[PDB]
Amino acid sequence: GQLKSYQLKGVKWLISLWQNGLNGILADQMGLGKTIQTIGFLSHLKGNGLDGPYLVIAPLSTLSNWFNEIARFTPSINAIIYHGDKNQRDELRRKHMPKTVGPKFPIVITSYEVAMNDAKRILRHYPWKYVVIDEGHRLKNHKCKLLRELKHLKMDNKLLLTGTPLQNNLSELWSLLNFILPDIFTSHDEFESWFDFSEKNKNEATKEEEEKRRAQVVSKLHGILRPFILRRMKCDRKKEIIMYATMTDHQKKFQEHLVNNTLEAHLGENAIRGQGWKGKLNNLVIQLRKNCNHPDLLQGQIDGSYLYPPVEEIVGQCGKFRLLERLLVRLFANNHKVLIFSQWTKLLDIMDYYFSEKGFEVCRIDGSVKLDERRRQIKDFSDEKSSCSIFLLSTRAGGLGINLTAADTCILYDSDWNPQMDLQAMDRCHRIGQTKPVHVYRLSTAQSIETRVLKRAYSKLKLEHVVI
Amino acid sequence: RYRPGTVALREIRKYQKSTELLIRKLPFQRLVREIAQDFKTDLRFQSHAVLALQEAAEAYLVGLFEDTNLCAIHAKRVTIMPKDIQLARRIRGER
Amino acid sequence: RYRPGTVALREIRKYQKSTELLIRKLPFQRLVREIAQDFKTDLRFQSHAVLALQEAAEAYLVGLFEDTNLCAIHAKRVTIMPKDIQLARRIRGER
Amino acid sequence: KMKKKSVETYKIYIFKVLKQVHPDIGISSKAMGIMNSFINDIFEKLASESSKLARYNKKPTITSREIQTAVRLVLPGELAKHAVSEGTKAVTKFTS
Amino acid sequence: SVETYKIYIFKVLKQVHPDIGISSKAMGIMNSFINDIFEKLASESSKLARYNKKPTITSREIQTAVRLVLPGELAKHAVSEGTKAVTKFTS
Amino acid sequence: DNIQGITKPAIRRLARRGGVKRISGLIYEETRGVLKVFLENVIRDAVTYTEHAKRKTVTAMDVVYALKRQGRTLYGFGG
Amino acid sequence: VLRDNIQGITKPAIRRLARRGGVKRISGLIYEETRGVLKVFLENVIRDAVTYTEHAKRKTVTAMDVVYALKRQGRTLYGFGG
Amino acid sequence: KSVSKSMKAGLQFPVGRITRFLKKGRYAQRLGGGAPVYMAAVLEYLAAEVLELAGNAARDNKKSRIIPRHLLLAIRNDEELGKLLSGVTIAHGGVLPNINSVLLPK
Amino acid sequence: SVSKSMKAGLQFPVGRITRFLKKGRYAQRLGGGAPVYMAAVLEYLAAEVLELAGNAARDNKKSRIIPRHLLLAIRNDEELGKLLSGVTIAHGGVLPNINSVLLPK
DNA sequence: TGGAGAATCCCGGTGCCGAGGCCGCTCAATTGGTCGTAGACAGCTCTAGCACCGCTTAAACGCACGTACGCGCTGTCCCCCGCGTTTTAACCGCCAAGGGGATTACTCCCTAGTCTCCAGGCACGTGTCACATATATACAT
DNA sequence: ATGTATATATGTGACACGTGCCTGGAGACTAGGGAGTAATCCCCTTGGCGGTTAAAACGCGGGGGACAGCGCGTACGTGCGTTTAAGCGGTGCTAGAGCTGTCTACGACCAATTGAGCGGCCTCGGCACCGGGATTCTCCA
C-alpha cells in the first residue's frame, strides 16, 4: 500500500494501546504522516463491527484537506463537515442524525471555533465514542474549560495529536496530561520533585559534573514519559549563520539619551509648542527592542503624511540595516532567491518603502488581505518569467505549503522568543524535493538587549534531549 | 414602501422602553484616553470609571436633546437646528 | 408726535444705567406681611429683610425677563407672550 | 485568611422592611446598591445640614430639635410633615 | 466686638492704588466675599480630608482645594504665590 | 388686594431694565403668580430659620441663609 | 494609518440618542455641535477626576473619583457606589 | 440578659451604628439621647415609602422581582420624589416614555 | 517678638486664620503652613479684585469706589464671571446690553 | 367601509442560574461606675418696630387715536427618509513577559497641652472733600 | 429746516487723622502617636494574529416641510387731563432681644463581657429562549 513499515508500527501501537483501554497522546513530527495513520486506525476500528461515532477537531484551514484524505483513501467512507453559517447550521443539525440507535452514523469533523461557540448543542442530544484532536497547541494556559463540560458526559476515548509538545514552558506536561489522564491530579501539583538544579545552569553545554541527582532524575524523566509519548524518525542541507552588526554613534546617542528618558525636554523645542507629546514610554523591554531594531519605528512622536527621511541617509541609523544591504548586494551575484522574515508590520512597511525606492518589485503577506494570498502567489511569483525577487513574510501569519520552494535563501531580521516559531519558519523555508543548500541567515546586534533574548531562547530550545 | 414618518415613531417607541447602551464602548474609551492624555501623562483607567462616564454622557445628551426638542416645538417646527441647541445652552447657563 | 419705538429705546438706555429701586417699598412690605401671615402668626420684620427680599425679587424678575426676551427673539418676534415665560421656566427647571 | 475588608451595608434591614411591606416580592442584586446609595446620601445630607445648623447658632450639641428643623428644611412638601409625626412617636416610646 | 477685615483690605488697597478711597458700602461686600471664599475653601478641605480617611489638614489638601475651587488661570496663579509664602515661613 | 399692589408701570420698568421693546397685555398675571411663588418659597425657609432659634422676629441673616439654600447668594447685607 | 477619535461618535449613534429623546426629523448640521459639547463635558469631568486621582498619590483612576467628580457638578449617579 | 436600643424603640434599623457613624464624622462636640432614634425612624420611613412605590410599580407590570427600571418608574411618577430626586440619574434606568402631541400623526 | 505675618511677608494676619480654623473644628489637627497659604490666596484674590475695581473706577473719571464699579469689574471678566455667576450685589445694577434686532434701521 | 401584507403580543414547553437558606467565628454593642460642665430657669434693662395724624405732590388711571406688526394664505424648491447592496470594524479569544499599584509589617519628630505677658486691634473727637442748582452747544420728523 | 439731550460756574453730610483701653498672639517647657520606611500578588499593557457577525457607508428616487412674499385687521404705544396714595416728619407705647447669675443632670470616659453580623457552602423556582397562533396596523382601494 501507500504506507510504509513505520506507519504500520504506529498503527499496531495504537491498537495495542486501545487493547489496554488508555487514552492516547501522539507527537509525530511529520504532519501528513499522522492523519493517514489515524484514518487507517479508525478504519480498522470501523470494519470490525463497532458502531461508535467519531468526532474530529482540527483548525479550519485543513478541514477540506481531511475531505481530500477520505476521498484519497476510500470513496465508500463518507463523513460530514459541521462548518456553516448560522442559517444552514440548524438545517444540518438533524440532517444526518435521525435517531440515537440505527445502522449508520456519520463521522463528524468540526473546528475549534465550533467547539467553543454554541457548543452546548452537541452534548445535549447525543454521546460520542471517539474524540480526536488534530493540533494540540491550544490547551496549555487552561483558558478553554468547555473540555470539562465535554468531560462531564462520558467520552470513552480521546486521542490528541501534537506537532511539538515541547515549548519548554512550565506545566505543559501538567496541562496536557490532565486533559488526557486527569486521574493523577495531586501527583503533579508540586513540580519540585521533577525539577532539578540541572535546569538552572549557565553552562553552554548545560552539563555539570559537580551537581548531584542529574542522571537519576533525567533517567526517570524519560522513563516514565516514554510509554505515553511516541516519537518516530524518518530515517529509522541547512546552514544557519548569525551575523552581528556594530552600533552606530547616532543610535547609541538615542540609547543613552533615553536610558534616563530625557527625550521630552530635548525635542520639546524642536516640536511645535501647543501640540503636546503622544505619551511617556510604559515598558522597558519592548521599547528597547524597537530601538535596537530601528530608531525610525519610534517616530510616532512626530507627525507627517508618510514623510520619511531620504533613503541615502537611512542607512546611517543602523548597522543591522547596513549589514543587510551589504548581504543583499553580495547575494545578487549568487543569482538566488531570498525571503525576509519579520515580526512587526511597521518594519514590513519601512522595508517596503525602502524597496519601493530601490525600484525592485516585491511580494508581501501582511495579513490585511483575505483570500488574496493564493492570487498573490500565482501572480508575479512561482513563475519562470516572474521578475519579483523579494518576498516579505511575518512568522505569525500563514503562508501556503509550496512544494516548489523557489526561494532557497531565508533571512531572519529579528528573532523570536519561542524557537518553535523559528522551526515552522524553517519548515516553510525549505521542504522535501530540493537539493539546493539552505544558507539561513540571522541579523543580530552584539552587546544589546536582544542578545539576552537569543541566549534565553537557545537555552529554552536546549531541553529537547530530556524528552523522548 | 412605507410612508415617511412611521419608522421614526416606531424607533421612538422601541428605544424608549429598552435599558441598554447606545454608544459603543471601545471607541469611547479611546476618546477618553486621548482626552485625558492632554492633562496628565501615563494614566490608567478602570472599566467602571469609563462605564460611569458613558452613562453620564448619555444622560446629559438625552436631556440636552429633550430640551432642544422642546425649543424646536416652541417655534412651530419639526426639524432640529444648531441654533435651538445654542438657545437651550444659553438659557440653561452652560455657555 | 414721535414715531413709535423711540421712547422705548430711550427708556431702555436710561433705566440700564441707573442704580435705584423700581418697585415701591410700602406695598411690597404689605404683600410680604400678607404672604407671611399664612405660615406663622404675629411675625415681625426688620427693614433690611424686606429690602433684601425686594432686591432678590427684582434681580430674579430681570433675569427672567432677559431669558423671556431671548426666547422671544429666537422665534422671530418683537412682542412678549406668556408661552415664552412658560418655555423659559420649563427649560430652567423652575416648574 | 481574610477574604476582604468587612463592609457595612443596610442589605438585611432593607430586606426586612421589604418583607414587612410586601409579603411575596423579591429584589435583585442591582437595586440594593441603589437603595444603599440613596440611604447614605440622605444620611449625609441630614448630618451635614444638622452640623451646619449647629455651627451657625453657636451651639456645641446636636439635639432632636436640630434634626427636626433639618427634616423640615431638606424634605419638601408633604413628606416633611409626615416624617415628623412618625419620628416624634419613636422618641416618646424611647424615653418612656 | 466684631471681627472684620476692614483694616487689612484698606492696607492692601493703599498698597495697590496710592490715591483711591473706598466707600462704606463696598467694605461689607468685600468682607462677605472673603468670608464666602474662606468658607468654601474650608468646607472643601474638610470634605477632602474626610473622604481620604485622613485626620490632618496639610498644605497639599488646600493645594488641591485651590486647584478644584478656583477655575481657569486663577488656580495656576494662586498656587505659585502661596507656595512662595510657605517656603519663606519654614526657612 | 395686596397682589394688585404690583402695578403695571412697575412691571413695565422691570421689563425695560431687561431690554424689552414691546410688551403684550397678558403677562402681568404670570409675573404676579411667579413673584408670589418665589416669595412663598423664600418666606417658608425664612420662617423655618426664625422658628428654629426660638424667636419671633425675622432678621436679615435668616433671609440671607434662605437665599443661600436656594443657590442665589446675595452680597452687601452680611453674608 | 489612523482615524480621528472624535469621528468615532458616528451618525447612527447620534441618531439613536436623538430618537431616545423623542425627535422626529433631524438636520445634517447638528453633529459638530454635539461632538463639541460632548468633548467639553468630558474635559470638564476628566479635569476633576484627574485632580482627585493625583491628590491621593496614585496613578490609576477608580470609579469613586468619577462619582465624586460628578457629585461636584451636581449630577449624582447611582449604582456604582456613591 | 440585654436588649438592643432598636428593639425597645420598635425600629428595624440599627441604632448603635448610626451613633458610630455620627461619632466617627465629628459633626459636633456632643450628641443627644434620641437623635439616632429619630434619624433611624426617618430613614426607615423613607425606605418603606420608596419600597412601597417600587413594589407597586413592579407588581403592576406582572413581575415578581424589582429591577432598576421599576425604581426609575416609581421615582419619576411621583411629584414628591420627583422634586427630591430631580437631579439624580439611575444606572440602567432608562427614560420615561413621553411623546408630544404635535408629532402624533393625524 | 515678631509676628507670623511679618516674617512671611504677607499683609493678612495669620493667628486669626488659625483661630478661625480651630474654632470651626474642621479636623483634629492642623498644619504648619496652611494658614500662611490660605492668607496668601486670600490676599492675592483681594489684590486682583481691588485692581479690577480700581481700574474700573479710574476709567469713569472718579476717585472713589462704589458698588457699581465692583459690579462692572466682576461682570467684565471671564474668570470672575465664572467665579461669581450666581451672586447678586446690592445696589449694583445691570450690565448695559442691547440686542441688535431691537436697534432701529 | 373593505381587502391585504405585515408587525406584535399570548400561550405553551425547556431548561438553569442567582436568590434564599444552612454553618463558624469575632468584635463592637451593651452594662455599670464616676466626673464635670452645659442647658434650663429666673430676673433685669434698653430699644426699636407698630399705630397714628396732617401735608403735599409725583404718579397711576382713564381715555382717545392712529399705525405697525402678527397671523393666515399660496406657491416653489430642495433636502432628509426609506430601502437595497457591499465593505468593515467590534467582539472574542490567545501569545509572551514584565511591572506596578493593592495590600500587609516597623521608628522619630511635629503637634497637643500648660503658663505667662505686652505691642496691636476696636470705641470716641476734628479738617476736608464729590454731588445739587443755574448758563452754553449738537441731533430726529 | 425747528424743539430736546450733554458740557461748565458756586454751595453742602460722609471720609482720612488723632486719642484712649483691653482681651489674645507669641514665647517658652514637656508628652505621644501618626506620618514616614520593605515583602507578596494579581490586574494592566504593547505589539501582533485568526475568525465571525452585525453595523455602517454609499447610492438613489421621491414627497412633504422650510421659506419668502403678500395682504388685512386690530391691539398696543403716545399724549393729555383727573384723582390718589406714598413719602415724610413727628409722637406715643409696649413686646421683646440680649445679658448675667445659679442650680442639676445627662453625656464623656473607662473596665468587662457576649451574642448578632459577615464570610464560607447546599438547593432549587422565576426568568431567558424556540415555536406556533391569534390579533391588530397601516396602506391602498
Author numbering:
A (entry chain P): 200 to 435, 442 to 673
B (entry chain E), C (entry chain F): 40 to 134
D (entry chain D): 53 to 148
E (entry chain C): 58 to 148
F (entry chain H): 24 to 102
G (entry chain G): 21 to 102
H (entry chain B): 22 to 127
I (entry chain A): 23 to 127
Question: What did the paper state?
Answer:
A nucleosome core particle comprised of H2A.W, H2B, H3.3, H4, and 147 bp Widom 601 DNA was assembled with full-length DDM1. Like other Snf2 remodelers, DDM1 has two main lobes, each consisting of a parallel β-sheet core surrounded by short α-helices, connected by a flexible linker. The HELICc domain of DDM1 interacts with histones H3.3 and H4. The majority of the interface is formed by a loop in DDM1 (residues 480–487) that makes contact with H3 at the C-terminus of its α1 helix (residues 73–81).
Nucleosomes block access to DNA methyltransferase, unless they are remodeled by DECREASE in DNA METHYLATION 1 (DDM1Lsh/HELLS), a Snf2-like master regulator of epigenetic inheritance. An N-terminal autoinhibitory domain inhibits, while a disulfide bond in the helicase domain supports activity. Here we show that DDM1 promotes DNA methylation by preferentially remodeling heterochromatic nucleosomes during S phase, when H3.1 and H2A are deposited, allowing DNA methylation of CG dinucleotides by the methyltransferase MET1.
